[PDB]
Amino acid sequence: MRWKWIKKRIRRLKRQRKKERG
Amino acid sequence: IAKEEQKIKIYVTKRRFGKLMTIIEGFDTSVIDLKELAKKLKDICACGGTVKDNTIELQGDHRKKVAEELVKMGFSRDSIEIR
Amino acid sequence: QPEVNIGVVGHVDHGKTTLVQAITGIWTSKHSEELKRGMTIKLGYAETNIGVCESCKKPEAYVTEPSCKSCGSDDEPKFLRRISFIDAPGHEVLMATMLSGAALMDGAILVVAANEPFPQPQTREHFVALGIIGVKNLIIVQNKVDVVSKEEALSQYRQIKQFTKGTWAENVPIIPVSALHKINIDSLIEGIEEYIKTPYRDLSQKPVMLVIRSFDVNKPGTQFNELKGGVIGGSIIQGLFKVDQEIKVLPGLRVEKQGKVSYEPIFTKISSIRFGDEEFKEAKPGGLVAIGTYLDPSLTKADNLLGSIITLADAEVPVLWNIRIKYNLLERVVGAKEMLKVDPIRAKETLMLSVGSSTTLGIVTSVKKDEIEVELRRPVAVWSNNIRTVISRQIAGRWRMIGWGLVEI
Amino acid sequence: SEKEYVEMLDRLYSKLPQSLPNMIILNIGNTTIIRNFAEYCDRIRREDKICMKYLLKELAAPGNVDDKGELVIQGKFSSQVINTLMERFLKAYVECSTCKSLDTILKKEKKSWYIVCLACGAQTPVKPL
RNA sequence: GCGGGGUGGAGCAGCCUGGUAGCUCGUCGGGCUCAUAACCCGAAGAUCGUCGGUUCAAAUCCGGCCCCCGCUACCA
């Protein structure tokens, strides 16, 4: 679980933060 | 960048416990990457799968799906046969 | 050196290259072996001499060598100028290199096939790319007239004379050829001598040039002691370079620091200059040049600094990541077999920004009426404020021209 | 302005220039041997190696011609798929594109071959392979 | 430019470290079986890319010159 979520949250964050940074 | 096109045979197959599988054969192993293609296709089908020699195999009937996904990627509608 | 750069545009297999064979005698190679079985793929290149038989009758007076005894009589044809071609490919998706090529051109020749239904997907796509960019010196050509009825190459000349009407192309003259057997080519030479005139370029201007190839002269196995330098391949547009001038490339190579990205200018000296198969000491616009260098050929192998631009060392050129395009759109997608209407631009979308000879991709942050700001991946060296640009999208797996405009700094 | 053109058109145009024997196919373990691959290629004016290179590349198999004009393809192929890929050859390399005669020579230059009919007088250019 | 291969018709071993050219198939003949090239037996057939050297002797070791396929790349 919290492994999952942390990396899902991180990937969401990055990918989206990539989309914001871009 | 490159090009290359090939004759594509798609059909239902057979695996162990569990359902049938879908074979996609007939891609040019020099030019085309079955490993990049197949990662893309397992995403479309949502099935596990592999590159089995010069073929991609996808667990379950995905035959209309894949042809519809292969033609999108810029492959010829006229080289593809679902059997 | 060649005085001027002429395109040969058109649809796939309409015989653009075969018409560069019948004028220059030079084949593009048709290479990569995959081009030897496909067709031309990297930008071809070929030069020749255009004299004129003064002592005889035109168009057959228009020679290729110093030899007039071919037509009328001997009086060795006064040399008018030396020229060079740039053969773009004809296949739909090799759109992104033909655009790239079009940053170098002073004029063009549209090769339509006499044995196919006239407005063919790329024939048009190219044409409006021409009308867009500003290459207003066009000559249309009807190529394969050796395999058709004498009615058929006329009825098509109707279809061309009617398309070429509401568009800008007034008397853009349609010279039927047969690139295969090299018949009626000297009348094409009379066209290109009249209509595609040699422009004036001010040499005092800031040295600027584009790059579209670059090659490792080193054969498989030249020893270290005579390791000749790396070779950048491209065309001067403004100025004139000289042998033994200090220089820089832009945006230049990027570094890697743990996932970071950072391009930077490379410096070197001009080791040698050459045009055709003959080495020169200086170089001027019109023609594609090549510049022997003293930088590591590993840097310029396959065609690594493709899209880059060369300038004076210690010059003033912005290396932008983010850019303000003023722009306009085609009402259709003249390119696809299908004419589906160009949608209006959406933010956070991927588009293929051709600027100069570089073919970059980039993401759209802002969308006004006609002013968009585009973040990029690989930077762009913006040598002026008069940078024409071209705007494509991925419509259906294959990249398509949809709008154009100018670069604003 | 047509009168400049229509003059250039009339000036170019004034510079201008037997069934098929039943291919006998057999099988001998893992070989398919066209008994008359020499006589068949002799009666379309073609070089054994150009019908061989093509019919072999299309098959994706190896072979060489015997010492009496016989194709020994090293791969056992049914007696049909050799006709369908030997007709296609005819279509791309012997049948002229003007009147469909089969009565053609095969030109070669640098990198452009031409089908030259002995009946009408035109030239079908072919992808050189 | 380096390789990699070239051998009975065909697939190819053998070449390192030279010393009556092997295999599998096919063919051809006979035999065995009720009839099968299924098995048993035999024959035919490669002066081993090419040209030359060294060696008593080479398919082998050696070097020029070709024929297909990986490596390279349109070489300003």
Ligand SMILES: Nc1nc2c(ncn2[C@@H]2O[C@H](COP(=O)(O)OP(=O)(O)NP(=O)(O)O)[C@@H](O)[C@H]2O)c(=O)[nH]1
């Ligand atoms: N009969 C005839 N054949 C021609 C003529 N011009 C070219 N061909 C043939 O058509 C084929 C294609 O020619 P090519 O020049 O590659 O066409 P292209 O449009 O330049 N190809 P690319 O898209 O790569 O630039 C060649 O094999 C050539 O022999 C012509 O005037 N008449």
Ligand SMILES: [Mg+2]
């Ligand atoms: Mg071409």
